[PDB]
UniProtKB/Swiss-Prot annotation, chains A, B:
Consequence when changing C60A: No loss of activity
Catalytic activity: 4-imidazolone-5-propanoate = trans-urocanate + H2O
SUPFAM superfamilies in alphabetical order: Urocanase (SSF111326)
Gene: hutU
Binding site for NAD(+): 49-50, 127, 173-175, 193-198, 239-240, 260-264, 270-271, 319-320, 451-452, 489
Protein's recorded name: Urocanate hydratase
EC class (word): lyase
Organism (species): Pseudomonas putida (Arthrobacter siderocapsulatus)
Cellular compartments per GO CC: cytoplasm
Length: 550, 550
C-alpha cells in the first residue's frame, strides 16, 4: 500500500520524459524527493520529518507520474493530499501544478483526525517540502541551522564558538544537518540519535564526523576536542529523554542546547524513554493512544531537562519541532520559558526577506551548481558572509540526489540570481534547466505561533492570511508549481504555510515570470514583517520600493 | 475608526473612477456591499452574519478604495483581513485583488483569539461574501433556502407544501430570506426575530408578509392561512430560545423546523433568553466571557426544543449557523440527532456543480438584469423549474442596491451564461459590464463538517484541501478577484472556503478567462464530490468531459 521495494531517482540529462521542461521539472523533483541518497524512508514514500510523504500512496504516485508526463503547457494538475485529483485548463503563465496537502478544518486539525482519515486512505502529511517536491536532503535546512548557531554565538559568546559545544538530538533528514551546521559555526556537538541507521545515514553523507561508544566516551571526546579548539560533530546512539536528564544530574554543562527530534508527531516521531524504535513502531499500530501518551510523557521529562540547562545559564531554544507545546500539554507549565529559534535568532533575516532560498540542477551535473555558485559570488561581490558560505558548501556539503544549493538571500537578490540563472540556461552555460524554490519556512510563507511567527511584536502570531496570500500571489505571478500545506514542522493544528518552485528554462517567457515571482515571493515576507511594525522590514520595503498601501 | 455616519452606494452608469472595468468592478461591489439597502449595519461596516465586515475599519476602507482607484492592469492588490497591505506586479490575466480574511492557525482558530486580535486592530471577520464583496442582499441566499424547502417538501410531504408551515428564527440579512423562500415554496411560516428593526427591514424589502402581535395571534394566523392553502410568512418579535420551548410545551406541531439566528458567534449574534438586545450589546463588551456563556446556554434550550419537535416526527434540520455544535458543547449530547441542510437536502445539487451562481449589473439599471433573465431562459429553454424561478424572482424579489440575480445552475451552463452575458456587454445590449460571482457556499469552494461537507459518504468532512485548490485554480484561470476565508457561516474554527468573481466587460480577453474559470470553478465541485464517490458527480464529470486522473 505505502510500501514498494524500488529505488527511485530523478532522470538526468536533457532528454525530456514529460512534454516540456515546465512539466519535466516537477516530475524530476518528485522523484528526487524519493532518491535513496535523499529521502529517509522512500520505499514507504517518506521523505522526512516523521511521515512527510511525496505522494499519498504508490497507486497515487504512479498516477502523478503518468499524469505529469501527459500534462499540456496550458493545463494545470491539482494534487490533493498526495493524489492527482484533476486537470484543468489555465494558461502557459499559470502554475502547471497546484498542491494542497494535509489541510483540515481547524476544529478537526489534529493528528487523531488525520490518522483516522489516513486509515481511510484520505490523507497524506506533506510536511513542508515533502509533499511539494522541493526537498534536497539535509542541505535544505543546514544553512538555517548554521545561521541559528552563528547568531546564538554572537549573542552569547561574543562571536566565535571555538572551544564550545552544542547538545542536541535528532539525526533524521533535517536534524542530521545539526552536526555539520555546528561544525561550520566553529563548535563541537553531541548529537543523540535513537536509530543506528540514521547515524549511519549522516555518516555516509558526511554530516556528522564520528560516533561515540557510550555517554562517558562521548563526553571524553567533547572534552578533548573542545580543549583543542576543534569543531567535530559526535553522534551518540540513545534516547534524548534519558540522556539529557542524566547529563543534568551529572552537572554537565553544554554551551547551548536545543532539540530536533520529530516531537511534532508523538505517534511516529518521538521515542518514549526505554523503548526501542522497533517496539515504538509496532505498538503505534496496536495502542496508538497509549504510544502517543508515552511519547509526550518523555517529551515532558526532555523539556524539563532543557529548562534545567537554561536555569544553569546555558542558551537554550526550541528549534521548530513543537516539543515545548507537547511538554506543556503534559504538565510542564513553564515549558515556554525558553524561546523558539526565530524570535530569538533569525527574525531579523526574515525582515529583509532572507530565507532558505534554493535551486537544483535538473541535469544532475555537479558542475551546473558550481557554475551557479560562481555566478552568485559575481552577482553579490561584497558579501563576505555569503562568499564564505558558498565556499563552505562547496568544501563541506556533499550533493544528495540532483546537485542542489542552499543559499540564504532576500528581497532584491533572489530575482537578480533567478534572471541570471535563466540566462545561463539559455546560453548553454548550464547544461539543463534549473529549478528555484525554498522551504516553506521563509519570510512571508508561514504562520506558526510556536516557530516562525512566535512572539510577533504586534501579537499577530496566529494570523494565517499571509501564507494563503503568498500562494495566491505566486499562482498569479507564474511560479511553476505552488502549494498550501498544513502542520509542516510543528505538526497538525499549529501551522499553515505555502511553497513555490519556478523553472528557469532559459526562455523569455520564464524570465518574465521569474522577475515578478522572485520579487513578490520574498516581497510578501518583507510586507508581512513591515505590517507587524519591524523597522528592519519597513526600511527594506522602502529601499526595495515595495508598494505597501498602508 | 469603526463607525462612520455616511451612506455608501455603488457608483452608477458607465463613468469609471478606476483605471478600467476590472478595477472599477471590485470598487463598485465593495461599496454595494455597504449600500443602506443591502447591508445590515453599514455604518459599522457590518454587512451580515453577526459581525461580517467589508473592510477592517474606515481608515482601511478609504485606503482600499484609494488603491483600487489607481491600481494598474498588471497590478494585484493584496487584502489581508480587510486591509490593503500590498500591491505587486502580476499580469492582466491574473486577479486584480487577492483576498484572505479571518484565517487563523488551527490551534488558535476560535472567537476568543479572534476578538483579542480584533481589539488590537488586527482582524476582520469576512463571513463569506461580506469581506469578498459579492453580497447582493437577501437575494443571495433566498433561492438556496427555497431549494432546501422544496426538496424537504418532496422528501416529506409529497412535493408541493400546500397547507404546511415552517417554524424558524432569525430575520437578519440571510435569515430574512427564509420567510420569502417558504412562501415561494408554497408554505406559510412563523419567523421569530428579536430585533424590531430587522423585522422592519424584511417587511420593507418584501421578504416577510406580516407581523403577528404575539404567539397566540401568530398561531391563529398560521392555523387560518394553513387551512386555507395560502402561503404567507409571519414575523413574531421575540426570542426563539423562549418561543420554541413554549410551542413544544403547547403541543404545537410545525411541518418543518429549522433556525437561522447568528448562533455561530455567541458574543454578537445570539440573544440570551430574557435579555433585551440593549443589555446584550452592552454586556458584550463588559463581560464578554459571561455573555458567551449566557448565549450558549440559551442555544442549548433552543436546540433541545428542536430535538423535541423531531421526536414528534417533525422534519428538523440545521441551516448552517452551527447551533447544534454550540448546544452539544453546552451538554446537549444528542444535538446532532437532526441533520444539516446539505447532506439532507442540497448535496445532490452540489454533485452537479449547481449552487448560488449570480451576477450583478454594475450599471445599476434593472432592465440589464431583465435582459439577462430573458437571455437565461433562451439558453436554458427546457428547464421549467429554472424559468419558474426567474418569473418568481421578477415577481417577488425586490432589487437591493445594484440590480442582481441569483440563479442556481451548475457545471456547463455557468460558462454558457457567462460567455453570453459578456457578448451582451460587447454588443451594447447590456448598459455596462456585469460581474459574475457566487457565495462561498458552493460545490467545490467550502469544507465545513457541520454544514456544506457534513456527512460526506467517505468521511472526508474536514478535508479543506479542496477550497484552497479552488482559490488557487481560480487565480490561475483568470477570475477578477479571488478570496480565501475562514469561519464563514459556522464561525471561527468550523469552515474554510474560497470565493471568486469575474467581470464580463465585453472583451475577448475577458471571454477566454470566462470560458476557463466558469468551467473550472464548478468543475472542482464535481471533482470534489466525484472523489468522495457520489455517482451523480462521477456521471456529471463524464458528461462534461472533466479530466480527473484517478
Ligand atoms: N521549524 C521549521 O520550519 C522546521 C524545519 C525543518 C524541520 N523541522 C522539524 O525538525 C524535526 C526533525 O526533522 P527530521 O526531518 O530530522 O525528522 P525525522 O523524522 O526525519 O528524524 C527525526 C529523528 O529523531 C529521532 N528521535 C526521535 N525520538 C528520539 C529520542 N527520544 N532520542 C533520540 N532521537 C530520537 C528519530 O530516530 C529520527 O531519526 C521535525 O519535528 C521537523 O518537523 C522544523
Ligand atoms: N451555511 C451557510 O453557508 C450559511 C449561509 C448564509 C448564512 N448562514 C448563517 O445564518 C445565520 C444568520 O445569518 P444572517 O445574515 O441573518 O446574520 P445576522 O447577524 O444579519 O442576523 C441574525 C438575526 O438573528 C436574530 N436573533 C439572534 N438571536 C435570536 C434569538 N434568540 N431569537 C430571535 N432572534 C434572534 C438577530 O436579531 C438577527 O436579526 C448566521 O449564522 C450565518 O452565518 C449560513
Ligand atoms: O529544508 C527543507 O527542504 C524543508 C524543511 C522543513 C521545514 N519544515 C518542515 N520541513
Ligand atoms: O449569499 C451570500 O451573499 C453569502 C451568504 C453566506 C454564506 N455563508 C455565510 N453567509
Amino acid at each position: 500500500n505505502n510500501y514498494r521495494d524500488v529505488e527511485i531517482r530523478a532522470p538526468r540529462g536533457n532528454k525530456l520524459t514529460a512534454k516540456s521542461w515546465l512539466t519535466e521539472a516537477p516530475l524530476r523533483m518528485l522523484m528526487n524527493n524519493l532518491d535513496p541518497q535523499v529521502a529517509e524512508n522512500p520505499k514507504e514514500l517518506v521523505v522526512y520529518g516523521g511521515i512527510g510523504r511525496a505522494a499519498r500512496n504508490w497507486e497515487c504516485y504512479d498516477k502523478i507520474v503518468e499524469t505529469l508526463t501527459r500534462l499540456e503547457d496550458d493545463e494545470t494538475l491539482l494534487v490533493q493530499s498526495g493524489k492527482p485529483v484533476g486537470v484543468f485548463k489555465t494558461h502557459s503563465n499559470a502554475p502547471r501544478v497546484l498542491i494542497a496537502n494535509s489541510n483540515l478544518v481547524p476544529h478537526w486539525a489534529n493528528w487523531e483526525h488525520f490518522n483516522e482519515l489516513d486509515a481511510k486512505g484520505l490523507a497524506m502529511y506533506g510536511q513542508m517540502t515533502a509533499g511539494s517536491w522541493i526537498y534536497i536532503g539535509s542541505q535544505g535546512i543546514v544553512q538555517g541551522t548554521y545561521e541559528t548557531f552563528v547568531e546564538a554565538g554572537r549573542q552569547h559568546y561574543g562571536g566565535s564558538l571555538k572551544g564550545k559545544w552544542v547538545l542536541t538530538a535528532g539525526l533524521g533528514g533535517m536534524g542530521g544537518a545539526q552536526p555539520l551546521a555546528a561544525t561550520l559555526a566553529g563548535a563541537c556537538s553531541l548529537n543523540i540519535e535513537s536509530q543506528q541507521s540514521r547515524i549511519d545515514f549522516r555518516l555516509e553523507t558526511r554530516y556528522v564526523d564520528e560516533q561515540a561508544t557510550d555517554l562517558d566516551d562521548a563526553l571524553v571526546r567533547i572534552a578533548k576536542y573542545t580543549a583543542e579548539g576543534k569543531a567535530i560533530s559526535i553522534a551518540l546512539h540513545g534516547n534524548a529523554a534519558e540522556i539529557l536528564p542524566e547529563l543534568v544530574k551529572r552537572g554537565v554543562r553544554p554551551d547551548m542546547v536545543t532539540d530536533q527530534t520529530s516531537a511534532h508527531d508523538p505517534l511516529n516521531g518521538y521515542l518514549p524513554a526505554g523503548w526501542t524504535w522497533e517496539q515504538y513502531r509496532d505498538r503505534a499500530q496496536t495502542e496508538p493512544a497509549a504510544v502517543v501518551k508515552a511519547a509526550k510523557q518523555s517529551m515532558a521529562v526532555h523539556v524539563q531537562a532543557m529548562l534545567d540547562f537554561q536555569k544553569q545559564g546555558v542558551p537554550t531554544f526550541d528549534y521548530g519541532n513543537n516539543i515545548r507545546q507537547m511538554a506543556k500539554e503534559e504538565g510542564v507549565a513553564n515549558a515556554f520559558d525558553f524561546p523558539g529559534f526565530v524570535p530569538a535568532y533569525i527574525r531579523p533575516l526574515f525582515c529583509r526577506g532572507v530565507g532558505p532560498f534554493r535551486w537544483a540542477a535538473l541535469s544532475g551535473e555537479a558542475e551546473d551548481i558550481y557554475k551557479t555558485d560562481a555566478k552568485v559570488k559575481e552577482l553579490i561581490p561584497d558579501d563576505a558572509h555569503l562568499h564564505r558560505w558558498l565556499d563552505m558548501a562547496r568544501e563541506r556539503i556533499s550533493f544528495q540526489g540532483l546537485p542542489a544549493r542552499i543559499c540564504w538571500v532576500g528581497l532584491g537578490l533572489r530575482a537578480k540570481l533567478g534572471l541570471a540563472f535563466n540566462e545561463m540556461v539559455r546560453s548553454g552555460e548550464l547544461s539543463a534547466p534549473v529549478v528555484i524554490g525554498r522551504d516553506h519556512l521563509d519570510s512571508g510563507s508561514v504562520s506558526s505561533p510556536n516557530a516562525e511567527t512566535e512572539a510577533m511584536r504586534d501579537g499577530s502570531d496566529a494570523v494565517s492570511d499571509w501564507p494563503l496570500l503568498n500562494a495566491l500571489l505566486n499562482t498569479a505571478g507564474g511560479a511553476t508549481w505552488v502549494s498550501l500545506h498544513h502542520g509542516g514542522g510543528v505538526g497538525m493544528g499549529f501551522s499553515q504555510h505555502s511553497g513555490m518552485v519556478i523553472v528557469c528554462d532559459g526562455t523569455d517567457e520564464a524570465a518574465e515570470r521569474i522577475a515578478r515571482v522572485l520579487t513578490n515571493d520574498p516581497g510578501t515576507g518583507v510586507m508581512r514583517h513591515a505590517d507587524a511594525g519591524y523597522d528592519i522590514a519597513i526600511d527594506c520595503a522602502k529601499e526595495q520600493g515595495l508598494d505597501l498601501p498602508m
